[PDB]
Amino acid sequence: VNSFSGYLKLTDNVYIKNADIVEEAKKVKPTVVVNAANVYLKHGGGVAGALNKATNNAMQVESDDYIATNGPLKVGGSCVLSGHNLAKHCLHVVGPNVNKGEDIQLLKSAYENFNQHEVLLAPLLSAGIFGADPIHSLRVCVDTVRTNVYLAVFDKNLYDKLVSSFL
Numbered sequence: 001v002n003s004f005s006g007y008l009k010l011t012d013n014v015y016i017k018n019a020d021i022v023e024e025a026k027k028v029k030p031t032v033v034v035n036a037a038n039v040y041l042k043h044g045g046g047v048a049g050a051l052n053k054a055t056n057n058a059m060q061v062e063s064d065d066y067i068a069t070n071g072p073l074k075v076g077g078s079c080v081l082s083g084h085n086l087a088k089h090c091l092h093v094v095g096p097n098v099n100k101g102e103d104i105q106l107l108k109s110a111y112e113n114f115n116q117h118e119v120l121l122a123p124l125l126s127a128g129i130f131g132a133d134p135i136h137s138l139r140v141c142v143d144t145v146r147t148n149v150y151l152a153v154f155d156k157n158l159y160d161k162l163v164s165s166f167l
């Protein structure tokens, strides 16, 4: 038993809700919140900009130190940093950005990072400003992630669509 509420169960291990991932994080304090990161950990917009703002920019400060020490992530890769006031940990995961021409097949590699964590609150990778089809992203998520994933979908319209087109 865990503290997640109002989720619709999609599969054995995937759950989905219409929700702002920022507010869901502040209420659940999950062990892991996933950020829709880029390779530079520059949290300007989308989910990343919203999560970072909710940390009063502490996420960005920590991220800049990480990059200065380690260099950029790989597309499809991840790193674990602090969750600040939102979670114990933030798993920064880089899905391919279609608006940068990145290979959508790397989306499966990106979701594989979730398997290193038993439970996660997460957005749909490569959705929103990353330009991929959220329905596709959901299919890859269901077919790749084996751990328990609680997906927060900000847009109510998108959500209802994802649900009603789900197989």
Ligand SMILES: O=C(O)C[C@H]1C[C@H](CNC(=O)c2cc3ccsc3cn2)C1
Binding pocket: 020, 021, 022, 045, 046, 047, 050, 127, 128, 129, 154, 155, 158
């Ligand atoms: O437009 C569509 O069809 C769907 C797109 C994908 C979804 C991306 N979500 C975000 O950027 C996001 C923004 C913010 C802002 C404050 S909290 C928050 C959570 N998330 C909207």
